[model samples]
Target: KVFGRCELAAAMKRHGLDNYRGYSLGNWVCAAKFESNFNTQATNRNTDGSTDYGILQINSRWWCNDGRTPGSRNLCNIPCSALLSSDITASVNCAKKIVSDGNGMNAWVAWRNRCKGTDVQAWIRGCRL
Candidate 1:
Protein backbone atom coordinates (compact mmCIF):
# COMPACT_ATOMS: atom_id res chain seq x y z
CA LYS A 1 0.00 0.00 0.00
CA VAL A 2 1.07 3.56 -0.67
CA PHE A 3 1.19 6.22 2.02
CA GLY A 4 1.62 9.98 1.96
CA ARG A 5 4.55 11.57 3.75
CA CYS A 6 2.41 12.84 6.61
CA GLU A 7 0.74 9.51 7.12
CA LEU A 8 4.07 7.77 7.09
CA ALA A 9 5.46 10.20 9.63
CA ALA A 10 2.52 9.72 11.92
CA ALA A 11 2.88 5.98 11.67
CA MET A 12 6.55 6.16 12.50
CA LYS A 13 5.82 8.39 15.46
CA ARG A 14 3.16 6.03 16.69
CA HIS A 15 5.67 3.20 16.42
CA GLY A 16 8.13 5.19 18.53
CA LEU A 17 10.61 5.43 15.74
CA ASP A 18 10.73 9.21 16.11
CA ASN A 19 13.77 9.03 18.40
CA TYR A 20 15.06 5.57 17.74
CA ARG A 21 18.82 5.12 18.11
CA GLY A 22 19.38 8.87 18.40
CA TYR A 23 18.31 9.46 14.82
CA SER A 24 15.61 12.00 14.22
CA LEU A 25 12.23 10.98 12.84
CA GLY A 26 13.09 12.84 9.65
CA ASN A 27 15.98 10.48 9.00
CA TRP A 28 13.76 7.40 8.95
CA VAL A 29 11.16 9.21 6.89
CA CYS A 30 13.71 10.31 4.33
CA ALA A 31 15.28 6.89 4.12
CA ALA A 32 11.93 5.15 3.68
CA LYS A 33 10.88 7.65 1.02
CA PHE A 34 13.95 6.91 -1.05
CA GLU A 35 14.03 3.19 -0.28
CA SER A 36 10.45 2.28 -1.11
CA ASN A 37 8.38 5.48 -1.41
CA PHE A 38 6.20 4.32 1.47
CA ASN A 39 4.99 1.27 -0.38
CA THR A 40 4.26 -1.52 2.07
CA GLN A 41 4.55 -4.16 -0.62
CA ALA A 42 7.88 -2.92 -1.89
CA THR A 43 10.50 -5.56 -2.62
CA ASN A 44 13.78 -5.49 -4.52
CA ARG A 45 16.15 -8.19 -5.65
CA ASN A 46 19.76 -7.32 -5.07
CA THR A 47 22.71 -7.93 -7.36
CA ASP A 48 23.93 -10.60 -4.97
CA GLY A 49 20.60 -12.41 -5.20
CA SER A 50 19.42 -11.32 -1.80
CA THR A 51 16.08 -9.54 -1.66
CA ASP A 52 14.98 -6.45 0.19
CA TYR A 53 11.63 -6.66 1.93
CA GLY A 54 9.04 -4.11 2.95
CA ILE A 55 8.91 -0.38 3.70
CA LEU A 56 12.34 -0.29 5.31
CA GLN A 57 13.66 -2.78 2.78
CA ILE A 58 14.94 -5.22 5.35
CA ASN A 59 17.22 -7.78 3.76
CA SER A 60 16.32 -11.41 3.40
CA ARG A 61 19.89 -12.56 3.94
CA TRP A 62 19.94 -11.16 7.41
CA TRP A 63 16.53 -10.14 8.63
CA CYS A 64 13.80 -12.37 7.27
CA ASN A 65 12.96 -15.71 5.70
CA ASP A 66 11.16 -16.09 2.39
CA GLY A 67 11.74 -19.89 2.32
CA ARG A 68 12.96 -19.66 -1.27
CA THR A 69 16.21 -18.24 -0.03
CA PRO A 70 18.98 -20.28 1.61
CA GLY A 71 21.10 -19.49 4.65
CA SER A 72 19.10 -16.55 5.94
CA ARG A 73 19.95 -15.45 9.44
CA ASN A 74 16.29 -14.72 10.02
CA LEU A 75 17.14 -12.31 12.76
CA CYS A 76 13.64 -10.98 12.84
CA ASN A 77 12.18 -14.49 12.75
CA ILE A 78 9.33 -13.47 10.50
CA PRO A 79 7.95 -14.36 7.12
CA CYS A 80 8.96 -12.06 4.31
CA SER A 81 5.32 -11.19 3.70
CA ALA A 82 5.06 -9.77 7.19
CA LEU A 83 7.12 -6.85 6.02
CA LEU A 84 4.61 -6.11 3.29
CA SER A 85 1.67 -5.57 5.55
CA SER A 86 -0.13 -2.24 5.68
CA ASP A 87 -0.16 -2.49 9.49
CA ILE A 88 3.62 -1.82 9.60
CA THR A 89 4.09 -3.17 13.12
CA ALA A 90 6.16 -6.16 12.05
CA SER A 91 8.22 -4.09 9.66
CA VAL A 92 8.91 -1.44 12.28
CA ASN A 93 9.94 -3.99 14.88
CA CYS A 94 12.33 -5.61 12.46
CA ALA A 95 13.68 -2.23 11.49
CA LYS A 96 14.40 -1.43 15.14
CA LYS A 97 16.42 -4.61 15.49
CA ILE A 98 18.27 -3.83 12.28
CA VAL A 99 19.14 -0.33 13.45
CA SER A 100 20.32 -1.71 16.77
CA ASP A 101 22.69 -4.13 15.10
CA GLY A 102 25.42 -1.54 14.40
CA ASN A 103 24.93 -0.19 10.89
CA GLY A 104 22.31 2.18 12.24
CA MET A 105 20.78 4.08 9.33
CA ASN A 106 23.82 3.23 7.26
CA ALA A 107 22.45 -0.28 6.82
CA TRP A 108 20.22 1.09 4.12
CA VAL A 109 22.14 2.04 1.02
CA ALA A 110 19.39 4.51 0.15
CA TRP A 111 19.85 6.23 3.47
CA ARG A 112 23.61 6.46 2.98
CA ASN A 113 23.39 7.61 -0.61
CA ARG A 114 20.37 9.88 -0.58
CA CYS A 115 19.18 10.86 2.90
CA LYS A 116 22.54 11.08 4.64
CA GLY A 117 24.11 14.51 5.13
CA THR A 118 21.21 16.17 3.39
CA ASP A 119 18.51 18.57 4.52
CA VAL A 120 15.65 16.17 5.31
CA GLN A 121 13.08 18.59 6.66
CA ALA A 122 10.81 18.01 3.71
CA TRP A 123 10.38 14.40 4.76
CA ILE A 124 8.32 15.45 7.73
CA ARG A 125 6.74 18.48 6.16
CA GLY A 126 3.18 19.20 7.38
CA CYS A 127 3.23 16.23 9.77
CA ARG A 128 1.79 17.70 12.95
CA LEU A 129 3.81 15.30 15.04
Candidate 2:
Protein backbone atom coordinates (compact mmCIF):
# COMPACT_ATOMS: atom_id res chain seq x y z
CA LYS A 1 0.00 0.00 0.00
CA VAL A 2 1.13 3.55 -0.72
CA PHE A 3 0.87 5.10 2.72
CA GLY A 4 0.89 8.86 2.98
CA ARG A 5 3.53 10.43 5.17
CA CYS A 6 1.16 11.75 7.81
CA GLU A 7 -0.78 8.54 7.79
CA LEU A 8 2.45 6.66 8.33
CA ALA A 9 3.42 9.06 11.08
CA ALA A 10 0.12 8.64 12.89
CA ALA A 11 0.42 4.90 12.78
CA MET A 12 4.01 5.07 13.95
CA LYS A 13 3.00 7.27 16.82
CA ARG A 14 0.25 4.88 17.76
CA HIS A 15 2.75 2.07 17.61
CA GLY A 16 5.22 4.02 19.77
CA LEU A 17 7.79 4.61 17.06
CA ASP A 18 7.52 8.32 17.74
CA ASN A 19 10.14 7.96 20.45
CA TYR A 20 11.21 4.39 20.54
CA ARG A 21 14.42 4.03 22.53
CA GLY A 22 15.23 7.69 21.97
CA TYR A 23 14.80 7.49 18.21
CA SER A 24 12.38 10.17 17.09
CA LEU A 25 9.41 9.90 14.76
CA GLY A 26 11.47 11.62 12.11
CA ASN A 27 14.05 8.89 12.29
CA TRP A 28 11.45 6.25 11.71
CA VAL A 29 9.91 8.27 8.95
CA CYS A 30 13.16 8.89 7.20
CA ALA A 31 14.16 5.29 7.53
CA ALA A 32 10.85 4.09 6.19
CA LYS A 33 11.07 6.38 3.18
CA PHE A 34 14.50 5.21 2.25
CA GLU A 35 13.93 1.56 3.01
CA SER A 36 10.65 0.93 1.31
CA ASN A 37 8.91 4.20 0.47
CA PHE A 38 6.36 3.05 3.05
CA ASN A 39 5.27 0.15 0.88
CA THR A 40 3.92 -2.65 3.03
CA GLN A 41 4.67 -5.28 0.42
CA ALA A 42 8.22 -4.14 -0.23
CA THR A 43 10.83 -6.83 -0.31
CA ASN A 44 14.54 -6.71 -1.15
CA ARG A 45 16.96 -9.56 -1.50
CA ASN A 46 20.27 -8.93 0.18
CA THR A 47 23.61 -9.93 -1.28
CA ASP A 48 23.82 -12.50 1.49
CA GLY A 49 20.67 -14.09 0.01
CA SER A 50 18.40 -12.97 2.86
CA THR A 51 15.39 -10.77 2.27
CA ASP A 52 14.24 -7.60 3.96
CA TYR A 53 10.57 -7.51 4.85
CA GLY A 54 7.91 -4.80 5.19
CA ILE A 55 8.14 -1.04 5.60
CA LEU A 56 10.87 -1.22 8.17
CA GLN A 57 12.57 -3.85 6.07
CA ILE A 58 13.11 -6.29 8.89
CA ASN A 59 15.64 -8.91 7.90
CA SER A 60 14.56 -12.48 7.35
CA ARG A 61 17.87 -13.83 8.58
CA TRP A 62 17.18 -13.05 12.19
CA TRP A 63 13.78 -11.49 12.64
CA CYS A 64 11.22 -13.50 10.71
CA ASN A 65 10.66 -16.68 8.76
CA ASP A 66 10.33 -16.38 4.99
CA GLY A 67 10.16 -20.19 4.75
CA ARG A 68 12.47 -20.16 1.75
CA THR A 69 15.31 -18.67 3.73
CA PRO A 70 17.59 -20.83 5.83
CA GLY A 71 19.20 -20.01 9.19
CA SER A 72 16.49 -17.59 10.16
CA ARG A 73 16.64 -17.06 13.89
CA ASN A 74 13.06 -15.75 13.74
CA LEU A 75 13.70 -13.57 16.73
CA CYS A 76 10.33 -11.90 16.31
CA ASN A 77 8.71 -15.34 15.90
CA ILE A 78 6.40 -14.09 13.15
CA PRO A 79 6.00 -15.02 9.52
CA CYS A 80 7.78 -12.78 7.05
CA SER A 81 4.54 -12.60 5.09
CA ALA A 82 2.88 -11.03 8.12
CA LEU A 83 4.94 -7.89 7.62
CA LEU A 84 3.77 -7.45 4.08
CA SER A 85 0.27 -6.41 5.06
CA SER A 86 -1.23 -2.95 5.48
CA ASP A 87 -2.11 -3.71 9.10
CA ILE A 88 1.33 -2.96 10.48
CA THR A 89 0.90 -3.91 14.11
CA ALA A 90 3.07 -7.00 13.81
CA SER A 91 5.74 -5.14 11.88
CA VAL A 92 5.78 -2.35 14.40
CA ASN A 93 6.04 -4.77 17.29
CA CYS A 94 8.88 -6.55 15.55
CA ALA A 95 10.67 -3.25 14.91
CA LYS A 96 10.43 -2.30 18.57
CA LYS A 97 12.02 -5.58 19.53
CA ILE A 98 14.79 -5.04 17.00
CA VAL A 99 15.61 -1.57 18.31
CA SER A 100 15.61 -2.85 21.88
CA ASP A 101 17.94 -5.66 20.93
CA GLY A 102 20.96 -3.30 21.19
CA ASN A 103 21.51 -1.86 17.68
CA GLY A 104 18.69 0.66 17.88
CA MET A 105 17.90 2.17 14.46
CA ASN A 106 21.40 1.27 13.45
CA ALA A 107 19.90 -2.04 12.45
CA TRP A 108 18.61 -0.18 9.41
CA VAL A 109 21.42 1.00 7.21
CA ALA A 110 18.99 3.35 5.52
CA TRP A 111 18.69 5.25 8.78
CA ARG A 112 22.43 5.59 9.04
CA ASN A 113 23.06 6.37 5.40
CA ARG A 114 20.20 8.69 4.56
CA CYS A 115 18.51 9.92 7.72
CA LYS A 116 21.39 10.62 10.05
CA GLY A 117 21.97 14.34 10.49
CA THR A 118 19.47 15.19 7.79
CA ASP A 119 16.45 17.46 8.15
CA VAL A 120 13.88 14.80 8.87
CA GLN A 121 11.27 17.13 10.31
CA ALA A 122 9.55 17.30 6.94
CA TRP A 123 8.96 13.59 7.25
CA ILE A 124 6.26 14.47 9.78
CA ARG A 125 5.70 18.12 8.90
CA GLY A 126 1.95 17.92 8.44
CA CYS A 127 1.31 15.13 10.91
CA ARG A 128 -0.55 16.20 14.02
CA LEU A 129 1.00 13.52 16.09
Candidate 3:
Protein backbone atom coordinates (compact mmCIF):
# COMPACT_ATOMS: atom_id res chain seq x y z
CA LYS A 1 0.00 0.00 0.00
CA VAL A 2 2.77 2.34 0.92
CA PHE A 3 4.31 2.79 -2.52
CA GLY A 4 7.26 4.83 -1.08
CA ARG A 5 9.08 7.73 -2.72
CA CYS A 6 10.90 5.77 -5.43
CA GLU A 7 7.86 3.92 -6.74
CA LEU A 8 5.78 7.00 -6.33
CA ALA A 9 8.35 8.94 -8.31
CA ALA A 10 8.28 6.29 -11.00
CA ALA A 11 4.52 6.46 -11.05
CA MET A 12 4.56 10.22 -11.19
CA LYS A 13 7.05 10.10 -14.03
CA ARG A 14 5.11 7.50 -15.96
CA HIS A 15 1.97 9.46 -15.36
CA GLY A 16 3.75 12.58 -16.66
CA LEU A 17 3.65 14.74 -13.57
CA ASP A 18 7.18 16.05 -13.75
CA ASN A 19 5.76 19.56 -13.64
CA TYR A 20 2.99 20.84 -11.43
CA ARG A 21 -0.16 22.38 -12.77
CA GLY A 22 -2.78 24.20 -10.79
CA TYR A 23 -5.79 22.51 -12.39
CA SER A 24 -4.92 19.31 -14.23
CA LEU A 25 -2.93 17.60 -11.48
CA GLY A 26 -6.06 17.27 -9.39
CA ASN A 27 -7.92 15.49 -12.15
CA TRP A 28 -4.98 13.18 -12.87
CA VAL A 29 -4.77 12.26 -9.20
CA CYS A 30 -8.50 11.81 -8.98
CA ALA A 31 -8.52 9.68 -12.12
CA ALA A 32 -5.70 7.53 -10.72
CA LYS A 33 -7.65 7.07 -7.52
CA PHE A 34 -10.64 6.15 -9.57
CA GLU A 35 -8.75 3.91 -11.98
CA SER A 36 -6.49 1.68 -9.88
CA ASN A 37 -5.94 3.41 -6.57
CA PHE A 38 -2.76 4.70 -8.22
CA ASN A 39 -1.43 1.15 -8.37
CA THR A 40 1.25 1.04 -11.08
CA GLN A 41 1.39 -2.77 -11.06
CA ALA A 42 -2.31 -3.39 -10.65
CA THR A 43 -3.80 -6.20 -12.70
CA ASN A 44 -7.28 -7.66 -12.87
CA ARG A 45 -7.37 -10.98 -14.67
CA ASN A 46 -10.54 -12.73 -15.71
CA THR A 47 -11.12 -16.48 -15.51
CA ASP A 48 -10.89 -16.72 -19.28
CA GLY A 49 -7.58 -14.83 -19.42
CA SER A 50 -9.01 -12.88 -22.33
CA THR A 51 -10.00 -9.77 -20.50
CA ASP A 52 -8.70 -6.65 -18.78
CA TYR A 53 -5.17 -6.81 -17.41
CA GLY A 54 -2.24 -4.79 -16.03
CA ILE A 55 -1.96 -1.34 -14.46
CA LEU A 56 -4.22 1.51 -15.50
CA GLN A 57 -6.69 -1.34 -15.93
CA ILE A 58 -6.18 -1.98 -19.64
CA ASN A 59 -7.69 -4.69 -21.81
CA SER A 60 -4.47 -5.90 -23.40
CA ARG A 61 -5.60 -8.67 -25.71
CA TRP A 62 -8.35 -6.60 -27.21
CA TRP A 63 -6.30 -3.43 -27.54
CA CYS A 64 -3.33 -4.59 -29.51
CA ASN A 65 -1.80 -2.97 -32.60
CA ASP A 66 -2.45 -5.93 -34.90
CA GLY A 67 -5.67 -4.35 -36.15
CA ARG A 68 -7.61 -7.44 -35.22
CA THR A 69 -9.94 -5.46 -33.00
CA PRO A 70 -12.10 -2.45 -33.68
CA GLY A 71 -10.04 -0.28 -31.31
CA SER A 72 -6.73 -1.26 -32.85
CA ARG A 73 -5.70 2.10 -34.16
CA ASN A 74 -2.16 1.95 -32.84
CA LEU A 75 0.24 -0.90 -32.13
CA CYS A 76 2.81 0.42 -29.72
CA ASN A 77 0.51 2.67 -27.74
CA ILE A 78 -3.20 3.18 -26.93
CA PRO A 79 -3.62 0.02 -24.83
CA CYS A 80 -3.94 0.60 -21.13
CA SER A 81 -1.31 -2.01 -20.32
CA ALA A 82 1.17 -0.62 -22.82
CA LEU A 83 0.64 2.87 -21.57
CA LEU A 84 0.74 1.81 -17.95
CA SER A 85 3.91 -0.19 -18.36
CA SER A 86 5.79 1.70 -21.03
CA ASP A 87 5.09 5.02 -19.43
CA ILE A 88 3.22 6.11 -16.36
CA THR A 89 3.85 9.53 -17.88
CA ALA A 90 1.13 8.68 -20.35
CA SER A 91 -1.44 8.52 -17.60
CA VAL A 92 -0.87 11.95 -16.14
CA ASN A 93 -0.01 13.39 -19.52
CA CYS A 94 -3.11 11.95 -21.08
CA ALA A 95 -5.29 13.03 -18.21
CA LYS A 96 -3.79 16.48 -18.24
CA LYS A 97 -4.25 16.62 -21.97
CA ILE A 98 -7.88 15.68 -21.54
CA VAL A 99 -8.47 18.13 -18.71
CA SER A 100 -6.77 20.93 -20.59
CA ASP A 101 -8.31 20.11 -23.91
CA GLY A 102 -11.31 22.48 -23.64
CA ASN A 103 -13.94 23.27 -21.07
CA GLY A 104 -12.36 20.31 -19.34
CA MET A 105 -12.26 21.91 -15.94
CA ASN A 106 -15.99 22.51 -16.01
CA ALA A 107 -16.52 18.98 -17.25
CA TRP A 108 -14.36 17.62 -14.46
CA VAL A 109 -16.14 19.81 -11.96
CA ALA A 110 -19.43 18.39 -13.15
CA TRP A 111 -17.99 14.91 -12.88
CA ARG A 112 -17.18 15.71 -9.27
CA ASN A 113 -20.85 15.42 -8.44
CA ARG A 114 -20.71 11.71 -9.24
CA CYS A 115 -17.33 11.10 -7.63
CA LYS A 116 -17.46 9.76 -4.04
CA GLY A 117 -14.36 11.31 -2.47
CA THR A 118 -13.49 14.84 -1.44
CA ASP A 119 -14.04 17.36 -4.21
CA VAL A 120 -10.92 17.96 -6.28
CA GLN A 121 -12.30 21.11 -7.85
CA ALA A 122 -12.48 22.75 -4.47
CA TRP A 123 -8.92 21.77 -3.88
CA ILE A 124 -7.98 23.26 -7.21
CA ARG A 125 -9.73 26.41 -6.17
CA GLY A 126 -7.15 26.80 -3.42
CA CYS A 127 -8.77 24.60 -0.78
CA ARG A 128 -5.47 22.92 0.00
CA LEU A 129 -5.49 19.14 -0.39
Best by lDDT: 2
lDDT digits (tens) for residues 33-108 of candidate 1: 9899999999999877789988899899989998766778899999888899999999999999999998888999
Best-first order by lDDT: 2, 1, 3
Question: What TM-score does model 3 achieve against the real structure?
Answer: 0.43
Q: Is candidate 2 or candidate 3 better by TM-score?
A: 2
Candidate 2: worst-modelled 10 consecutive residues by lDDT? 120-129
- After superposition, the stretches of candidate 3 with alpha carbons farther than 4 Å from their true spots are 1-24, 43-68, 74-79, 101-118, 121-129
Instruction: Provide the overall lDDT of each model, using Cα atoms, as 2-decimal numbers.
Output: 0.90, 0.91, 0.45
lDDT of 2 by residue, 15-59 (tens): 888878998899998998999999999999998889999999999
For 1-129, candidate 3 gives per-residue lDDT tens digits of: 324334544465455553444443444445445555656666555454534433334444434332333443342356554554644654454445444555653333324544435564432343323
Q: List runs of model 1 lying over 4 Å from the truth.
A: none
List the candidate 2 regions with Cα displacement exceeding 4 Å.
none
